[PDB]
Amino acid sequence: AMTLSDCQQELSLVQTVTRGSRAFLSREEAQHFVKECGLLNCEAVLELLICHLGGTSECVQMRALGAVASLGCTDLLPQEHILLLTRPRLQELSAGSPGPVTNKATKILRHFEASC
């Protein structure tokens, strides 16, 4: 955590994008998230999203995965670099019981692997 304590703007962003009752980001929310990512440290945002993939509820996991997918479909980080950072947690989730989070993590992982 201490290597992220100076990432308070990034934490606020991730807390914003992951709160809400719908499991899918809106077009507006995703575009806002991506715009703000461009102004902050993308890698730290991704590490904080990965933190929210564990120890949370199903809806927060779904929105955090959505945010990972959105960032992956930009050019803010090389997509091989997004894969390097996200592969372990995406592999763990994809090994889980069938369900929304398992399915969504699997599709994201298969997409990042295909691009490389």
Automatic annotation (TrEMBL):
Entry's localization field: Cytoplasm, Cytosol; Cytoplasmic vesicle; Golgi apparatus, trans-Golgi network membrane
Signal peptide bounds: none
Job description of the protein: Associates with the adapter-like complex 4 (AP-4) and may therefore play a role in vesicular trafficking of proteins at the trans-Golgi network.
Assembly and binders: Interacts with AP4B1 and AP4E1; the interaction is direct and mediates the association of TEPSIN with the adapter-like complex 4 (AP-4), a heterotetramer composed of AP4B1, AP4E1, AP4M1 and AP4S1.
Protein name: AP-4 complex accessory subunit Tepsin
Organism (species): Equus caballus (Horse)
Lineage start: Eukaryota, Metazoa, Chordata, Craniata, Vertebrata
